Design a protein around this nucleic acid. Structure first.
Lengths: 77, 77, 78, 77
DNA sequence: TTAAAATTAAA
DNA sequence: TTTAATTTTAA
């Protein structure tokens, strides 16, 4: 390939790798918060579901919760 | 490697690949059930949720849901 | 929902769950193949890679690999 | 739960969610880098493979690749 | 979307 | 040390 093209490839790779280093740091910071929470006596598993739950629109989730209750009711569970 | 060594290797590969084919068939059959369910007016997302839930122990389930409600009401939404 | 709709739902759930039990069994058997292989001196990680590779069309993988080497060479990685 | 426990939970959730926002922001930046690369005639799929490969130790990578060559050849490849 | 796929943490 | 769960990719 070209010399310039080789330059772009190298820049792209280095750029992605810098971003993935930042991502890794953030992931470590998240695990540190949960570590702190666990030390406080909180249930990490539930805490994570709390975060996940809050990511979706309230109205939509509650609607889906209602459908779930309808289904669980139908199959007798 | 030996003739017996490669003989074993060829056996392992053959065994894994035959099981992969069967696993693929089952996975396709599972999607067909959901496709049919969707066509019948059911919510596939909720359906998969129902399946997931029924895999969990009843006790632990309501136990983690109780903690969830505690956390959720504590932080509100 | 209707008593009939209830029937459809239950049958659907039963179908998925029986199929998932089947899937778990197959996945367990696959694991048993790898564990037996591992006990015989084979590299499990490499074995799975072989299986993965053999899933792709020879033509495709050969070209993707060619491109890969081109990139790895360009950045002085290889 | 105590008011202190309530305060802990509130900040724990808020800290995680802010980190999630940042992590998600980096993830879209990475997709943008790859999106731009695609426009520059680069193979995104191969690009990602280069990154993953560079995350492994050169010495170990060459070793696994050597074994791979042995296996493939043994079964005909 | 769907996936299958995997390395990894921890029960 | 085996079910989990975390991550990422294919497709």
């Amino acid at each position: 390939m070209n010399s310039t093209a080789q330059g772009q490839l190298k820049s792209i790779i280095e750029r992605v790798e810098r971003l993935e280093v930042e991502k890794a740091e953030i992931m470590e910071q998240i695990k540190e918060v949960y570590a702190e929470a666990k030390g406080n006596g909180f249930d990490v598993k539930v805490l994570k579901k709390v975060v996940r739950i809050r990511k979706q629109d309230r109205a939509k989730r509650q609607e889906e919760d209602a459908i779930l209750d309808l289904y669980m009711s139908a199959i007798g569970e």
